[PDB]
């Protein structure tokens, strides 16, 4: 799927759209969510209808349970989850020179998101000694900046390709005498512009 | 499929994957520090964050080394060393007896903390600009008036 | 929305697009600017100041400035530097009750 969000007009105040356009979007959205459930070509592999999501969660996941009565947890028995995203009965069954040094220090220096942070003595380590420490291990600012940079650089490598894919898929119905099978495993993560008639309709 | 916003900060903006803003994550890191230092510890079974064996060994080794320098250069070794390293071999049996935890407090709340004293605490709100961000982002300087230095703290963060 | 309802005689989804906008403004009327009577004066213990639009992964279009909502955004002074941001501790769901009730009173009037 090539790359709406209202969080811009809540916290960032962008508000770069005319009032009539926003109103029109709202009208069409409510009508679409309510009255296009189970309607051909209009109400389909669409993530704006809550009932489709209910159905997928009803036939694919296991029953979800309610919230808990414990404290220090979020609502369920768990803690708050990260802000930036990078068989057996009992535990009595779950407790079983170049390469050594180079690989130990190689896997020791990598970035670990789930490490807490260490604190400094308010009178920082003396000069040169501080340089022996990776910066991301004693300062929140540096670690968070690194994680943010990683996530954003990874996002910026999507580079939609659906245009040329679309044209070369629409290409093969002007020829004669061959057949094309395109197999996959996860047909729901595909783009809806491929499932449109004339490109990939026959499913098996 | 409807949440009710039970345990969290009331209004929080999204994070770098969507919004390039770094304040929620900066507060989450201190949240995790608090968890590790007060509630859980670092392994299942500890009363809190504890000084490990590897460190109790390194304190011993530092003191041993300083004591040697002194006496030797001013002027029973390898046995202690070998048995100390085979002591180091454990380092993972989590069922060791550590009778007291005052060394953690003495090292992390007196030596790294209120043994000292910070002097940049507050400021009167009437600066040359209408803000503290504008002053800190201004063109020239406003922390000079002998000409002693007068600065202001960053704004405290809260996270409940 | 209230005109459509008073002419047609029946509720519609037009109201849906109004209250949303209105509610946003009403919150800004009570928390950020402090015009209401929440507490005896209008000063509450908490408020949500906007953030600059630099943080977003922005865009660019050939449009003018919006009628009001982008033109009345000239009175805000967002936050720009991250280490001087203030956020009071969130209210306590018994204070939140009274504050959201003030918002409701404004909207109903």
């Amino acid at each position: 799927r090539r790359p709406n969000g209202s969080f811009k007009e809540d916290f960032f105040g962008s508000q770069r759209d005319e009032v009539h356009e926003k109103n029109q979007v709202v009208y069409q959205l409510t009508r679409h969510a309510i009255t296009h459930y189970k309607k051909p070509f209009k109400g389909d592999y669409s993530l704006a209808i809550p009932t489709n999501l209910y159905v997928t969660d009803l036939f694919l996941k296991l029953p979800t349970q309610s919230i808990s009565n414990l404290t220090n947890v979020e609502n369920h028995n768990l803690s708050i989850k990260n802000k930036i995203q990078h068989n057996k009965n009992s535990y009595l069954q779950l407790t079983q020179t170049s390469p050594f040094s180079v690989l130990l220090l190689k896997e020791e220096k990598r970035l670990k998101p789930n490490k807490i942070v260490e604190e400094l003595p308010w009178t920082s380590l003396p000069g040169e000694q501080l340089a022996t420490k990776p910066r991301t291990s004693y300062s929140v600012r540096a670690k968070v900046a690194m994680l943010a940079e990683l996530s954003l650089s990874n996002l910026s490598a999507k580079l939609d390709m659906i245009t040329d894919l679309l044209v070369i898929i629409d290409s093969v119905r002007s020829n004669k005498g061959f057949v094309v099978f395109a197999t996959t495993d996860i047909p729901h993560v595909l783009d809806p512009a491929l499932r449109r008639p004339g490109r990939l309709d026959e499913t098996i | 499929l409807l949440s009710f916003a039970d345990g969290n900060i009331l209004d929080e903006p999204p994070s770098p994957p969507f919004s390039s803003l770094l304040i929620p994550a900066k507060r989450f890191e201190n949240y995790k520090r608090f968890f590790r230092d007060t509630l859980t510890g670092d392994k299942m079974g500890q009363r809190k964050s504890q000084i490990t064996l590897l460190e109790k060994l390194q304190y011993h080794m530092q003191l041993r080394s300083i004591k040697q320098l002194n006496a030797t250069f001013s002027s029973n070794a390898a046995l202690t060393s070998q048995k100390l390293d085979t002591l180091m071999s454990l380092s993972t049996n989590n069922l060791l007896q550590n009778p007291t935890n005052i060394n953690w407090y003495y090292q992390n709340r007196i030596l790294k903390r209120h043994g000292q004293y910070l002097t940049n605490q507050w400021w009167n709100g009437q600066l040359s600009e209408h803000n503290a961000e504008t002053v800190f982002l201004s063109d020239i300087d406003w922390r000079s008036s002998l000409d002693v230095l007068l600065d202001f703290p960053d704004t405290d963060q809260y996270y409940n | 929305g209230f005109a459509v309802r008073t002419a047609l005689g029946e509720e519609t989804n037009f109201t849906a697009a109004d209250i949303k906008r209105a509610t946003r403004m009403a919150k800004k009327y009570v928390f950020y600017y402090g015009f209401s009577e929440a507490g005896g004066a209008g000063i509450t213990t908490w408020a949500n100041q906007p953030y600059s639009g630099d943080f977003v992964i922005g865009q660019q279009r050939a449009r003018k400035v919006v009628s009001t909502d982008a033109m009345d955004a000239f009175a805000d002074w967002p936050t720009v530097s991250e280490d001087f941001r203030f956020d009071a501790p969130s209210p306590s769901d018994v204070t939140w009750h009274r504050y959201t009730d003030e918002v409701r009173r404004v909207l109903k009037g």
């Binding site: 809550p50 996941k61 | 916003a5 | 939140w96 009750h97």
Partner: peptide, 29 residues
Amino acid sequence: SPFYYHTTDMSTEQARVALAEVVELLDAA
């Protein structure tokens, strides 16, 4: 991108009333 589609931060005393209204709508239908 436990699954949740909506979210609310209204107090509990207003959530009680809102859900009572939803329930009586469903009962009438």
